[PDB]
Amino acid sequence: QQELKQAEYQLSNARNLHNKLTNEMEACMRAVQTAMKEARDLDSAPPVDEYITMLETDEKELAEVETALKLYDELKKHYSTIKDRALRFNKCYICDRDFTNQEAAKTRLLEKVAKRLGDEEKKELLEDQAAFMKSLDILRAVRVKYDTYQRLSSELPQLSREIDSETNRREDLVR
Protein backbone atom coordinates (compact mmCIF):
# COMPACT_ATOMS: atom_id res chain seq x y z
CA GLN A 1 0.00 0.00 0.00
CA GLN A 2 2.24 2.89 1.28
CA GLU A 3 4.82 3.01 -1.58
CA LEU A 4 2.21 2.44 -4.39
CA LYS A 5 1.24 6.14 -3.99
CA GLN A 6 4.91 6.99 -4.73
CA ALA A 7 4.98 4.55 -7.70
CA GLU A 8 1.80 6.15 -9.17
CA TYR A 9 3.15 9.69 -8.49
CA GLN A 10 6.58 8.90 -10.06
CA LEU A 11 4.88 7.36 -13.12
CA SER A 12 2.59 10.44 -13.45
CA ASN A 13 5.56 12.85 -13.15
CA ALA A 14 7.57 10.87 -15.73
CA ARG A 15 4.58 10.64 -18.15
CA ASN A 16 3.98 14.42 -17.97
CA LEU A 17 7.72 15.15 -18.24
CA HIS A 18 8.00 12.91 -21.35
CA ASN A 19 4.94 14.61 -22.91
CA LYS A 20 6.39 18.12 -22.22
CA LEU A 21 9.91 17.16 -23.44
CA THR A 22 8.40 15.57 -26.60
CA ASN A 23 6.48 18.82 -27.35
CA GLU A 24 9.64 20.96 -26.93
CA MET A 25 11.61 18.57 -29.21
CA GLU A 26 8.86 18.80 -31.89
CA ALA A 27 8.85 22.63 -31.65
CA CYS A 28 12.67 22.71 -32.08
CA MET A 29 12.38 20.35 -35.11
CA ARG A 30 9.75 22.64 -36.71
CA ALA A 31 11.85 25.78 -36.13
CA VAL A 32 15.03 24.11 -37.55
CA GLN A 33 13.09 22.73 -40.56
CA THR A 34 11.64 26.24 -41.19
CA ALA A 35 15.16 27.74 -41.05
CA MET A 36 16.55 25.08 -43.44
CA LYS A 37 13.63 25.74 -45.84
CA GLU A 38 14.14 29.54 -45.99
CA ALA A 39 18.00 29.52 -45.78
CA ARG A 40 18.39 27.99 -49.31
CA ASP A 41 14.86 28.90 -50.60
CA LEU A 42 13.51 25.30 -50.68
CA ASP A 43 9.97 24.34 -51.84
CA SER A 44 9.63 21.62 -49.11
CA ALA A 45 11.60 21.30 -45.84
CA PRO A 46 14.44 18.70 -45.57
CA PRO A 47 14.97 16.08 -42.81
CA VAL A 48 16.28 17.54 -39.49
CA ASP A 49 19.44 15.39 -39.76
CA GLU A 50 20.51 17.52 -42.74
CA TYR A 51 21.06 20.71 -40.72
CA ILE A 52 24.67 19.82 -39.79
CA THR A 53 25.58 19.41 -43.50
CA MET A 54 23.71 22.58 -44.59
CA LEU A 55 25.52 24.58 -41.85
CA GLU A 56 28.96 23.18 -42.78
CA THR A 57 28.35 23.88 -46.45
CA ASP A 58 27.41 27.48 -45.63
CA GLU A 59 30.36 27.93 -43.24
CA LYS A 60 32.68 26.79 -46.04
CA GLU A 61 31.01 28.41 -49.07
CA LEU A 62 31.16 31.73 -47.14
CA ALA A 63 34.85 31.23 -46.22
CA GLU A 64 35.64 30.46 -49.91
CA VAL A 65 34.11 33.72 -51.26
CA GLU A 66 35.79 35.71 -48.45
CA THR A 67 39.21 34.21 -49.40
CA ALA A 68 38.43 35.02 -53.06
CA LEU A 69 37.49 38.64 -52.12
CA LYS A 70 40.95 39.22 -50.52
CA LEU A 71 42.57 37.35 -53.45
CA TYR A 72 41.04 39.80 -55.95
CA ASP A 73 42.14 42.79 -53.79
CA GLU A 74 45.81 41.65 -53.51
CA LEU A 75 46.02 40.79 -57.23
CA LYS A 76 44.48 44.21 -58.07
CA LYS A 77 47.17 45.91 -55.89
CA HIS A 78 49.92 44.20 -57.93
CA TYR A 79 48.25 44.89 -61.35
CA SER A 80 47.75 48.56 -60.32
CA THR A 81 51.50 48.97 -59.59
CA ILE A 82 52.17 47.51 -63.09
CA LYS A 83 49.77 50.03 -64.76
CA ASP A 84 50.98 52.95 -62.61
CA ARG A 85 54.69 52.44 -63.36
CA ALA A 86 53.85 52.20 -67.07
CA LEU A 87 51.63 55.38 -67.08
CA ARG A 88 53.51 57.58 -64.56
CA PHE A 89 57.14 56.56 -65.18
CA ASN A 90 57.10 55.14 -68.78
CA LYS A 91 58.49 51.77 -67.57
CA CYS A 92 57.75 48.04 -67.20
CA TYR A 93 57.76 47.21 -63.44
CA ILE A 94 59.25 43.68 -63.70
CA CYS A 95 62.30 44.22 -66.00
CA ASP A 96 62.73 48.04 -65.37
CA ARG A 97 63.19 48.86 -69.11
CA ASP A 98 61.59 52.10 -70.37
CA PHE A 99 59.15 52.51 -73.31
CA THR A 100 60.97 55.39 -75.15
CA ASN A 101 60.31 54.92 -78.91
CA GLN A 102 58.26 51.76 -77.90
CA GLU A 103 54.69 53.15 -77.50
CA ALA A 104 53.14 49.97 -79.02
CA ALA A 105 54.81 47.74 -76.36
CA LYS A 106 53.51 50.17 -73.67
CA THR A 107 50.02 50.11 -75.27
CA ARG A 108 50.07 46.25 -75.27
CA LEU A 109 51.03 46.20 -71.54
CA LEU A 110 48.21 48.62 -70.63
CA GLU A 111 45.61 46.72 -72.73
CA LYS A 112 46.76 43.47 -70.98
CA VAL A 113 46.52 44.78 -67.37
CA ALA A 114 43.16 46.51 -68.10
CA LYS A 115 41.72 43.01 -68.91
CA ARG A 116 43.22 41.57 -65.65
CA LEU A 117 40.96 43.80 -63.42
CA GLY A 118 37.28 44.22 -64.43
CA ASP A 119 34.77 45.19 -61.65
CA GLU A 120 31.96 42.68 -62.51
CA GLU A 121 33.86 39.85 -60.73
CA LYS A 122 33.85 41.90 -57.46
CA LYS A 123 30.11 42.64 -57.88
CA GLU A 124 29.29 38.94 -58.39
CA LEU A 125 31.32 37.51 -55.46
CA LEU A 126 30.03 40.30 -53.14
CA GLU A 127 26.49 39.15 -54.10
CA ASP A 128 27.64 35.58 -53.30
CA GLN A 129 29.07 36.71 -49.91
CA ALA A 130 25.75 38.45 -49.12
CA ALA A 131 23.68 35.32 -49.97
CA PHE A 132 25.94 32.87 -48.07
CA MET A 133 26.11 35.21 -45.03
CA LYS A 134 22.27 35.53 -44.91
CA SER A 135 21.92 31.74 -45.25
CA LEU A 136 24.54 31.02 -42.55
CA ASP A 137 22.89 33.53 -40.15
CA ILE A 138 19.50 31.78 -40.56
CA LEU A 139 21.08 28.39 -39.74
CA ARG A 140 23.19 29.82 -36.84
CA ALA A 141 20.02 31.27 -35.25
CA VAL A 142 18.47 27.75 -34.77
CA ARG A 143 21.73 26.02 -33.57
CA VAL A 144 20.55 25.78 -29.92
CA LYS A 145 17.13 24.40 -31.03
CA TYR A 146 18.92 21.64 -33.00
CA ASP A 147 21.22 20.94 -30.04
CA THR A 148 18.19 20.65 -27.66
CA TYR A 149 16.40 18.46 -30.27
CA GLN A 150 19.54 16.25 -30.24
CA ARG A 151 19.87 15.89 -26.41
CA LEU A 152 16.10 15.34 -26.04
CA SER A 153 16.45 12.51 -28.62
CA SER A 154 18.81 10.78 -26.12
CA GLU A 155 16.87 11.80 -22.95
CA LEU A 156 13.34 10.75 -24.13
CA PRO A 157 14.21 7.00 -24.61
CA GLN A 158 15.99 6.92 -21.21
CA LEU A 159 12.87 8.49 -19.61
CA SER A 160 10.67 6.03 -21.60
CA ARG A 161 12.68 3.09 -20.11
CA GLU A 162 12.12 4.58 -16.65
CA ILE A 163 8.35 4.95 -17.43
CA ASP A 164 8.07 1.32 -18.67
CA SER A 165 10.07 -0.04 -15.70
CA GLU A 166 7.94 1.97 -13.21
CA THR A 167 4.80 0.82 -15.11
CA ASN A 168 5.86 -2.83 -14.54
CA ARG A 169 6.75 -2.00 -10.86
CA ARG A 170 3.21 -0.55 -10.46
CA GLU A 171 1.59 -3.56 -12.20
CA ASP A 172 3.47 -5.96 -9.83
CA LEU A 173 2.99 -3.81 -6.68
CA VAL A 174 -0.86 -4.22 -6.61
CA ARG A 175 -0.27 -7.55 -4.69
Annotated binding site for Zn(2+): 92, 95
Stretch 83-122: interaction string toward Zn ion, x if CB under 5 A: ---------x-xx---------------------------
Interface mask (CB under 8 A) for a second copy, residues 95-114, using x and -? xxxxxxxx--xx-xx--xx-
> Which of 82, 132, 135, 145 is close enough to bind a second copy by CB under 8 A?
82
The C-alpha angle with vertex 11 and arms to 5 and 15, in degrees rounded to 5, equals 145
DSSP string over 74-134: HHHHHHHHHHHHHHHHSB-TTT--B-TT-HHHHHHHHHHHHHH--SHHHHHHHHHHHHHHH
Is 3 near a second copy (CB under 8 A)? no
Query: For a second copy, which is the closer residue by CB, 4 or 71?
Result: 71
d(CA 51, CA 56): 9
Q: Which residues bind Zn ion (CB under 5 A)?
A: 92, 94-95
